């Protein structure tokens, strides 16, 4: 039973949490959601949900991981009635990494294709893609035309590539007929999982060496891309459209929900990655400074990435003689169709495409390593047998992730990708973070958390942080959960409708998690020997505080514990 | 480390080994193979191969299991190099139970359908099936016009039922588009695996009680069916065609292969089921009498089952105004299409259908319980952790079998079922029994086996049994392996042709097993410490005989051990 091995220094922890926070999300979702939701008036709700939420969900996780030096699952020894929330977060991090490696393999394939002197998205004549022949016109060289939209136009070579040569979506029909995994995508995913294993099989030390590169490279790529794009024509229009301020959009609830969702799904709060990274830290490390700096760097990175993305979008709109709303895109489309199309028109397209795909690959691999290491730590700190045999456990995790991601690399897959991502990530992690906040803040109390932080660092948390942990953040997460439940819509694609049972399978996974947490609470209620009040005592008190159960002095039963803020 | 739990009595072991043998392969394959391969001259090669290989293999397995009192994988402590063959046969019994439960669920679904006043296959229409939109003609009530192959008549209501209402083969095109598992087949397989878990969760005690019914019922069903069929018209012609003796086809070079395969796949020799069932027996139990009685009961059961099956076939041929070669069928077709069709024409079709389907369900359940208990014992005796938690291990095994059998209960599941059965069972168990015979006859030597049997039973094995164990059976298995390898043909169904990658996946599973055994031989070569002759010593000597390695007295290295019969 050797003690937990910490990071080499705080720099490695900072780079790891930055690489986990800064990912493809802050690049593909934040820019579009910024302009769509009030333009430059999105930063106000962004900061309003960053200063009352996210940061209270980041500082809390860092402090809980540092004081209680355990994984995501085993950190719930302070209240055993919530270890199911510690298993649900591991299951969510596994389900997310299931489809994240598919996008990583897509980025790897795009990188490998970028080495050609003539990029495939430049030519429509069967260049690494399958021409459907339905209007195989050039972007603007052969014949102009952007009648409807640039994101839903699936006849441009840049979109035809991702449609046919990479995904092979023309040989599938939907969920009912996905097909077989593609051989090239299978090899790309194999290389990805091999790199993941070779980075994670050693431990936290080599990961601290890989996060150096995977963090220092994407910032350099973004800086070079922005510097080269601001000189391009049409960049000023995109920049002005990005930061245009209109407070009239704030009256609606669309921005009021989108800013919260973006903050929550971009800061990475609630996932086991933060607890895992704060578990290998000194007992007197400053969680406050790290939690503030990580979120600040994440927001600044999102902003400077949106700047360059909308600069490229304005360049495209100027070259194609269209408006900004036409070239507006988000997600996989933005990262794989419109941006490589803009790279192709640029001089020396090979270097720009290669560096952009290297940046995307690094951003994906950093988050994948973070999530997989979080899963490994959470499953090891609970079952110490897997902690001793770490290499075999990591190999098994990587192989299982590859096998269960084989379904997402087939001729279809993007439908299963959307189903898994949306349902699992959204509702499961929302329920998980709501349970975490409620459980900690109420059953463990904010005064005990402040005392633990005082034991860690000299200064105590302010009254503002206590209020945020007690009322603001729990009510915020509850409101987000209620919105996700009420405003739920059936799964839909660009030109496909999901089967009536796909939503049922998604809600089945959701209910599996949301019973597995009550499955653990019921197991703890039943496994403990005693009675109604005898079992609740062991349920709502720390494991090391189980001796005072017979003494009949339970602080949680007292009203002063709940009233204490 | 409590000792191995013994059987209640020898009657339980006898009923278990009788059940594991009667699987439906004796009733759907033996009757057709007898008439096809020389009519009444098929018994001579059958009993010859039985005496020379089957009875020796059965005796060897029973004696080795009784002497070692260990699982299928753990029984190789006498030679660590061949221990991988235990994992091989475990994986084989798992892959076989993967598709065996599918046929069990088919029989269970046919059972519930029989609890109707008007059975589905009696008349055409949308009665529990789906019309192919081609006019469903009555078997022989409307139009007597038919062609030579009656088995391939896919327009009769009896075949249309199995094709549409049970399997739903009209909504699939092959392995490339299998579809989704059927809900009724899902419920049937769930009930099957629930019964299997409730029978096998406690241990050998409850199984020893279930084998009583599962063995005593099918014999009564066969007796009643034969007694009722001999009175029916056309039974005499079918019986005469069954016993029609022709020694001309003896030299066809095809009856010797078919009889050998029938004996080898109907006795159950080489599988872990026999070692598992002989691992709980007394140390002074008579393996010779039991091994002879099991094979005799199996052959007599196959013969009396073929009698009734060909009686029913002759009745059908007389009622349908066709010859015997026309109604000739084998396998799932025989058990699910032609026989229920004969039941429908009989008066009181409900009782006969119910009793026949209960017989088939019992014949499936006993074999499934034996196969699952083999894997359970083999993995428990190797990893004693699973032995302690027998209930959770059995639950996990049953749940994994159900999940991996979901692929076989879908629309196009029969193709994957045939692929798995043929490839895995045939070549994997052939290589496994070849390796077992070699390791027990040449490496471990027949002299040590005879000495162990002398300790178990007072009488020593005769010279004929030693010859069969050392030369006859190994050469027989090698010949069968060579025939299966050379005469291999690409997979095909009645109409659909398997794609090239189906054979690739089948040979991939084959090579997976046939490297996993050498994977273990290489592991034992590398794990041991010493030079080449020091590692080979520990590899070819028993675990309890590892002390004499340093003494430089290895019996296997001497030619006296090899040159001794
Ligand atoms: C933004 N930081 C979180 C990124 C990413 O987190 C990962 C990525 C891979 C594996 C596991 C996890 C938890 C994530 C992406 C989309 C939905 C949820 C999480
Ligand atoms: C007839 N002897 C037993 C039949 C059956 O044996 C089973 C059945 C299920 C699981 C494991 C085994 C060994 C079998 C079926 C087809 C090929 C080989 C064996
Ligand atoms: Cl963000
Ligand atoms: Cl047989
Ligand atoms: Na990163």
Swiss-Prot record, chains A, B:
Positions in the Extracellular compartment: 37-40, 115-181, 231-254, 311-350, 413, 494-496
Protein name from the UniProt record: Sodium-dependent noradrenaline transporter
Keyword Disulfide bond in record: yes
Effect of residue 101 to A: Abolishes norepinephrine uptake
Membrane topology classification: Multi-pass membrane protein
Entry function: Mediates sodium- and chloride-dependent transport of norepinephrine (also known as noradrenaline), the primary signaling neurotransmitter in the autonomic sympathetic nervous system. Is responsible for norepinephrine re-uptake and clearance from the synaptic cleft, thus playing a crucial role in norepinephrine inactivation and homeostasis. Can also mediate sodium- and chloride-dependent transport of dopamine.
Mutation effect (residue 20 to A): Loss of norepinephrine binding
Reaction catalysed by this enzyme: (R)-noradrenaline(out) + chloride(out) + Na(+)(out) = (R)-noradrenaline(in) + chloride(in) + Na(+)(in); dopamine(out) + chloride(out) + Na(+)(out) = dopamine(in) + chloride(in) + Na(+)(in); dopamine(out) + chloride(out) + 2 Na(+)(out) = dopamine(in) + chloride(in) + 2 Na(+)(in)
Effect after changing residue 407 to A: Decreased homodimerization and norepinephrine transport
Family indicated by similarity: Belongs to the sodium:neurotransmitter symporter (SNF) (TC 2.A.22) family. SLC6A2 subfamily.
GO MF term list: actin binding; alpha-tubulin binding; beta-tubulin binding; dopamine:sodium symporter activity; metal ion binding; monoamine transmembrane transporter activity; neurotransmitter transmembrane transporter activity; neurotransmitter:sodium symporter activity
Activity regulation summary: Inhibited by mazindol, desipramine, nomifensine and nortriptyline.
GO terms for cellular component: axon; cell surface; membrane; neuronal cell body membrane; plasma membrane; presynaptic membrane; synaptic vesicle membrane
Organism of provenance: Homo sapiens
Pfam families noted in UniProt: SNF (PF00209)
Outcome of substituting residue 386 to A: Decreased homodimerization and norepinephrine transport
Record note on what altering residue 501 to A does: Decreased homodimerization and norepinephrine transport
């Amino acid at each position: 039973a050797q003690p937990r091995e910490t990071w080499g220094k705080k720099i490695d922890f900072l780079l790891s949490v930055v690489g986990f926070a800064v990912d493809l999300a802050n690049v593909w979702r934040f820019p579009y959601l910024c302009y769509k939701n009030g333009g430059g008036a999105f930063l106000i709700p962004y900061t309003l949900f960053l200063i009352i939420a996210g940061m209270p969900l980041f500082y809390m996780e860092l402090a809980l991981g540092q004081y209680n030096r355990e994984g995501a699952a085993t950190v719930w020894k302070i209240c055993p009635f919530f270890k199911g929330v510690g298993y649900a977060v591991i299951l969510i991090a596994l389900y997310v990494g299931f489809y994240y490696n598919v996008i990583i393999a897509w980025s790897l394939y795009y990188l490998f294709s970028s080495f050609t002197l003539n990029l495939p998205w430049t030519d429509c004549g069967h260049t690494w893609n399958s021409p459907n022949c339905t209007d195989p016109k050039l972007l603007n060289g052969s014949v102009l035309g952007n009648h409807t939209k640039y994101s839903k136009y699936k006849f441009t070579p840049a979109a035809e590539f991702y449609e046919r040569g990479v995904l092979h979506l023309h040989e599938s029909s939907g969920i009912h007929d996905i097909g077989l995994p593609q051989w090239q995508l299978l090899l790309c995913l194999m290389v990805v999982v091999i790199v993941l294993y070779f980075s994670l099989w050693k431990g936290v030390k080599t990961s601290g060496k890989v996060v150096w590169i995977t963090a220092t490279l994407p910032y350099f790529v973004l800086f070079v891309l922005l510097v080269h794009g601001v000189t391009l024509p049409g960049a000023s229009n995109g920049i002005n459209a990005y930061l245009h301020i209109d407070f009239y959009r704030l009256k609606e609830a669309t921005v009021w929900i989108d800013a919260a969702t973006q903050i929550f799904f971009s800061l990475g709060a609630g996932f086991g990655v933060l607890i895992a990274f704060a578990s290998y830290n000194k007992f007197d490390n400053n969680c406050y400074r790290d939690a503030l700096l990580t979120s600040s760097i994440n927001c600044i990175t999102s902003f400077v990435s949106g700047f360059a993305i909308f600069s490229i979008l304005g360049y495209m709109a100027h070259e194609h003689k269209v408006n900004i709303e036409d070239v507006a895109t988000e997600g996989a489309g933005l990262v794989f169709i419109l941006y490589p199309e803009a790279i192709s028109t640029l001089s020396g397209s090979t270097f720009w495409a290669v560096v952009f795909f290297v940046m995307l690959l690094a951003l994906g691999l950093d988050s994948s390593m973070g999530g997989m290491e979080a899963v490994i730590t959470g499953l090891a700190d609970d079952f110490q047998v897997l902690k001793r045999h770490r290499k075999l456990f990591t190999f098994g995790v990587t192989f299982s992730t590859f096998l269960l991601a084989l379904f997402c690399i087939t001729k279809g897959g993007i439908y299963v990708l959307t189903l898994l991502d949306t349902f699992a990530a959204g509702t499961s992690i929302l329920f998980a973070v709501l349970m975490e906040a409620i459980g900690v803040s109420w059953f463990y109390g904010v005064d005990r958390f402040s005392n633990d932080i005082q034991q860690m660092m000299g200064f105590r948390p302010g009254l503002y942080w206590r209020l945020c942990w007690k009322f603001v953040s729990p009510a915020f997460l509850l409101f987000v959960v209620v919105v996700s439940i009420i405003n739920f819509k059936p799964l839909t694609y660009d030109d496909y409708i999901f089967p009536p049972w796909a939503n049922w399978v998604g809600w089945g996974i959701a209910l599996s998690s949301m019973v597995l947490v009550p499955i653990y609470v019921i197991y703890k209620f039943l496994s403990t020997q005693g009675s109604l009040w005898e079992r609740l005592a062991y349920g709502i008190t720390p494991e090391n505080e189980h001796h005072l159960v017979a003494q009949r002095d339970i602080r949680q039963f007292q009203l002063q514990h709940w009233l204490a803020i």
